[PDB]
């Protein structure tokens, strides 16, 4: 009767190339099944590991057990470039926490990081800490991106549209 769920560990749904991603299937024989773009992969452990991500590892992922049904598709985006603003989702309920991360390729030296909402700065850090909103207001909706000193060059990340909902 119960239905399986795919779990991203860590939470970030958009990652860069060469990153490490672990997908976990929940449910309850102790085998599992994994599918990518509606296509079974041969890994039948409870957790599927991506040691170094490539852009073709993108797409939706589904999993099932012999004691659970087919899960709902969990999308994954493997992005190219040097900088990337990471989020666990892109739609938030009001008063929920928003945890963002400005991540560099293979964690290359990242300093002077700035998080921006609608082309205006929100938080500045000397090193490379995470951006956090404890309780989401409706004014926190908009386009987010980060910018910092990746080694020697100033890099601006891509845009992520975050929308705050009410009911």
């Amino acid at each position: 009767l119960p239905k399986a769920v795919v779990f991203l560990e860590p939470q970030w749904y958009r990652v860069l190339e060469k990153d490490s991603v672990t997908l976990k299937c929940q449910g309850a024989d102790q085998s599992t099944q994994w599918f990518h773009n509606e296509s079974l992969i041969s890994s039948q452990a409870s957790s599927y590991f991506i040691d170094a991500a490539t852009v073709d590892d993108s797409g939706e992922y589904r999993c099932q057990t012999q004691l659970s049904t087919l899960s709902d598709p969990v999308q994954l985006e493997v992005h190219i470039g040097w900088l990337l603003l990471q989020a666990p989702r892109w739609v938030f309920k009001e008063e929920d926490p928003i945890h963002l991360r400005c991540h560099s390729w293979k964690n290359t030296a990242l300093h002077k990081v700035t998080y921006l909402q609608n082309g205006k700065g929100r938080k500045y850090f000397h090193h490379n800490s995470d951006f956090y909103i404890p309780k989401a207001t409706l004014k926190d909706s908009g386009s987010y991106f980060c910018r910092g000193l990746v080694g020697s060059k100033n890099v601006s990340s891509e845009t992520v549209q975050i929308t705050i909902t009410q009911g």
């Epitope: 860590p10 672990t22 926490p97 945890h99 991540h103 490379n128 800490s129 956090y132 404890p134």
Partner: antibody, heavy 120, light 107 residues
Framework: EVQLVQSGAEVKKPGESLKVSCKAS????????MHWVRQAPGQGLEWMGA????????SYAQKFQGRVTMTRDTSTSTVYMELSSLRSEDTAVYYC?????????????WGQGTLVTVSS | SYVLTQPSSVSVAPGQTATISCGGH??????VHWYQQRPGQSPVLVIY???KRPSGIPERFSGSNSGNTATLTISGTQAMDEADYYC?????????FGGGTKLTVLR
Amino acid sequence: EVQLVQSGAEVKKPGESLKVSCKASGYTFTSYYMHWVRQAPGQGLEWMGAIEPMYGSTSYAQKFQGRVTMTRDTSTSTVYMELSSLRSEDTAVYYCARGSAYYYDFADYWGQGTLVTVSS
Amino acid sequence: SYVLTQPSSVSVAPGQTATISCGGHNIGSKNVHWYQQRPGQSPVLVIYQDNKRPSGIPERFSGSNSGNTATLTISGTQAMDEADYYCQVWDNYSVLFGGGTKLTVLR
């Protein structure tokens, strides 16, 4: 399960350094922050800082900035805290605490604590 | 820079309900968490995010956050509830604790 086992008690003299370890277990170590909270004898809890174990980013309370140092060893799931220039006021039980829900808004698990007596 | 204000002591008869306050400037703007610390033990999370309860905590523990006062409420208090209770918030990339309230049982 989640376990937080800390190092044993320590005796210190004024001006020395303390370094305490916190071995995590029972979860994905790199997915959760790690708090460090101290409590003087008979006083209340006091936040000292936290560390992001995936990429080593830290954050300290301003009373301990320039004196506290936090590191982690991902291959051993161990978090390290260090405090320099110890005085008798630094006598306290030092706890490590796992940050909940992939940040350090609050702590959902605590270690057993480590007694550090700074005394002549 | 942010200040949380807790009462020093709180006394309650057995079975009766105890309430512990935690004051802060617009504390309703924040999610407030509470910890229980028995005399010589490690702290234990009892309420997180104003009202939510972790697994294994009795339902008689309840939390409320509205205005400039967050409140922890224990219904039928028992001798095990005799401990110190600390409120905690996250403010500008730092974690802060209240002074702590000692729960006393009357007789």
